[PDB]
Design a binder for this molecule. Sequence first.
Ligand SMILES: CC(=O)SCCNC(=O)CCNC(=O)[C@H](O)C(C)(C)COP(=O)(O)OP(=O)(O)OC[C@H]1O[C@@H](n2cnc3c(N)ncnc32)[C@H](O)[C@@H]1OP(=O)(O)O
Ligand SMILES: CC(=O)SCCNC(=O)CCNC(=O)[C@H](O)C(C)(C)COP(=O)(O)OP(=O)(O)OC[C@H]1O[C@@H](n2cnc3c(N)ncnc32)[C@H](O)[C@@H]1OP(=O)(O)O
Lengths: 429, 429
Amino acid sequence: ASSTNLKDVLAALIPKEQARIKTFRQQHGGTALGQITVDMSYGGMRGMKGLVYETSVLDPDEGIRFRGFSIPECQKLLPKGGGGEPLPEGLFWLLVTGQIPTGAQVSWLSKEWAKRAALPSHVVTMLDNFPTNLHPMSQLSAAITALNSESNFARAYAEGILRTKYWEMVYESAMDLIAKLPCVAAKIYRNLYRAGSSIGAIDSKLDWSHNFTNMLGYTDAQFTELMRLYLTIHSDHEGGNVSAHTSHLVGSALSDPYLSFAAAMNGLAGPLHGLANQEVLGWLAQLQKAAGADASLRDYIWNTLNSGRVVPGYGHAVLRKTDPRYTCQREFALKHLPGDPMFKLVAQLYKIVPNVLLEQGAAANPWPNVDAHSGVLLQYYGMTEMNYYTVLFGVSRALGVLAQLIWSRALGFPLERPKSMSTDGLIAL
Amino acid sequence: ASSTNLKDVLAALIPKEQARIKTFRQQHGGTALGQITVDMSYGGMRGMKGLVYETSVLDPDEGIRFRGFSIPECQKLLPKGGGGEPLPEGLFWLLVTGQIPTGAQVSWLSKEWAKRAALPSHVVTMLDNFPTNLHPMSQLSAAITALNSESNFARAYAEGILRTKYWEMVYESAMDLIAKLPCVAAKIYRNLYRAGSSIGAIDSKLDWSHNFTNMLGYTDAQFTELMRLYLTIHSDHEGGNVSAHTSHLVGSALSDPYLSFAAAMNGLAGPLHGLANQEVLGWLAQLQKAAGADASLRDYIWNTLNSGRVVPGYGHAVLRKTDPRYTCQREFALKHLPGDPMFKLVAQLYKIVPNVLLEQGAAANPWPNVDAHSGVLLQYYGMTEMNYYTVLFGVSRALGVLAQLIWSRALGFPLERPKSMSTDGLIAL
Ligand SMILES: CC(=O)SCCNC(=O)CCNC(=O)[C@H](O)C(C)(C)COP(=O)(O)OP(=O)(O)OC[C@H]1O[C@@H](n2cnc3c(N)ncnc32)[C@H](O)[C@@H]1OP(=O)(O)O
Ligand SMILES: CC(=O)SCCNC(=O)CCNC(=O)[C@H](O)C(C)(C)COP(=O)(O)OP(=O)(O)OC[C@H]1O[C@@H](n2cnc3c(N)ncnc32)[C@H](O)[C@@H]1OP(=O)(O)O
């Protein structure tokens, strides 16, 4: 009988996984995984194997994987609009379930996400009264924290549900959240950049990306394609990155998914993290302000380094090679905007930056990360409001942290609560 | 020459500490601190020595310490109003500097915090338009995220300051934040519980606690005393607790102190964490609803356990004994409200709960934690709005996470970014 239902699929999947994690632990719970050194402690857990996160695993050389699926692989296997880029909808099914979805499954997340899109009056209100000097990420985060009055897990909890059923409310929570995100995001864009206009409504027949672009006001067909790849590739990046790990950390205290995602964005918003999106553009904007020589480009990079700032869009805590997210973007540019000056500028830096970083001898990974290439793609299409870029990153990331949130709760993952130490204490240990 | 200035003290303190952490590492950076097992990974880092945090160290048996200062010790050594409880101001000086302040230093944080108290118009606005079904923690968090437009570190960063000077803007950031907190908190209270009234203004001559109580509208002299202990003992609890660790985690990406503190509250807001404050009261409220026998009390506890819920206010991830925060509160009650029925009820549970928890055989620590005792103290004084309790916890916690934030940045602590793994991956490792 019947038809598509992530939830019913999930219901078959949880017990097996549980069981499977049970014996594993019964047999290796005591196996040492690694060691912890002083340096790791002082170094922000660098190199520490500390979290279990399932939806994605990052390889230091090869880069991110969604099952064991690489970006190029997803590109090939996930369903497309009709027509080149992969639907973030399909990634999502993939992240939750471990399996490649059928277009028919994919069409289901679309409707579903379309059905759930709705904003409460208080939230709209707040967004409309916010000042234009309030950063876009700030507005996004305060808005999602403010949606928690709508929480199905928050409500269920207060009613006293048995802990075995958490995963069920979380899932509603997450589907509703994802569903709402674009409305919230577009409302910010519109208030800040298209004053007096309106987001309009969601069209049950479109895919999530395409309703987002409409609400953002973009008509360019290829722009929609950009959005679909963008939202897909920004999805997830294992659980130790600030944004994901934050969501995991807060979600672990039983704060609802709205509250964990909003904390997550306060993290995405850090310069060292997602804000790099925006930071690259400004730096590029500054560069061009002060078609240059490789050498003048180089004087430029040293000046940043010498000033005790970072070069944005370069380096990575885990990656040891060029981010396949960066390559992916590059290949998109070569097909669609190969003659763009900004693009050409990004291709040029690629030949200098890492060399300069190797020169300085401090960065462990001198290659570009995803942030180095995303904004140029956007700017080309007419979306030149750079302080807004990170919101896009936010909307995508929801796909991964929320898919995992549902698993944490399904698996009964407990309170994230490590032991801390002081310098005196350590010195004495 | 001259007079009091935390900042000038801090300026003398940073280089020494830096230097001191330099050689330490040069000599032990490679020393293994511990090991990581599968179980620890699956278990939310339980038992993992993973963070360096300086302001406070929690001993599993003896409980929290601010330098190496115990709660009873602070009680004795910190300056008081004039007249029994310790000023959260003095704790703060203590947390930042490692030293016991003089009343004259303490009077300085008071004025300082009084000088900096001010709310921007947009923030006030948002608070006034929020719905009454929007949880108090929600409102607090969206409000602090929304204050980030005022960030001195956010502004400085965008201007390109050298990384050596971060600690300086953070400190302004933190002093301004602490300073504002009570205004924000009281404005929420007032809107939600005293509609039509106003917070009134801050009096440069009072201490931080006493201006808070006034803005909250409480006149009881002993209530002020309660507040002063409360805000002091809730200050900090090492860095691995959700709230603190969150702030550390987000702050590590360079998000300003407003954004890190607001993420921190999304964490405090979890039932498993600070919300326990509130959870205890409701549970107590439910209990009394359905002067009882030890036995009926016991049937009551089993019913919670059997229902797959937690008993609130009991248990702890690190503590192995009764929280000295709990004892501290208990001793306050015995002096001031020994005949209170709710209090008597809390004393009774103390004789049953742990026994029942020992019975069940799942909790590692069956003793009460701070959350088990705080609300009864408040309720007694007429502050019976339990969904509000966690805000108080929030305002206090700022004292510790912000004091450490200033050190992280002063010490050049990098990006918190551990390695995650999947079950498949682990299974294969
Ligand atoms: C998408 C994500 O948010 S991740 C990347 C987005 N962020 C950026 O593009 C910002 C620039 N990048 C950086 O700040 C870093 O490369 C990070 C945060 C991505 C990685 O951090 P870490 O693991 O601590 O890097 P790494 O181990 O290479 O640091 C060694 C030294 O090189 C420096 N370094 C690394 N990347 C850079 C860079 N892009 N510009 C200048 N110096 C750099 C580090 O700051 C550090 O200096 P320090 O020892 O005085 O603190
Ligand atoms: C102030 C702070 O926020 S910390 C405490 C505030 N929180 C509370 O009072 C909520 C009740 N407490 C709890 O949920 C826990 O005792 C915590 C979160 C404080 C500690 O968490 P953990 O380190 O994971 O606890 P512990 O190791 O004892 O857990 C072992 C088992 O006992 C259970 N247990 C522990 N405390 C309780 C309690 N208060 N009621 C019922 N069962 C409990 C745990 O949930 C777990 O069950 P599980 O294996 O099916 O998941």
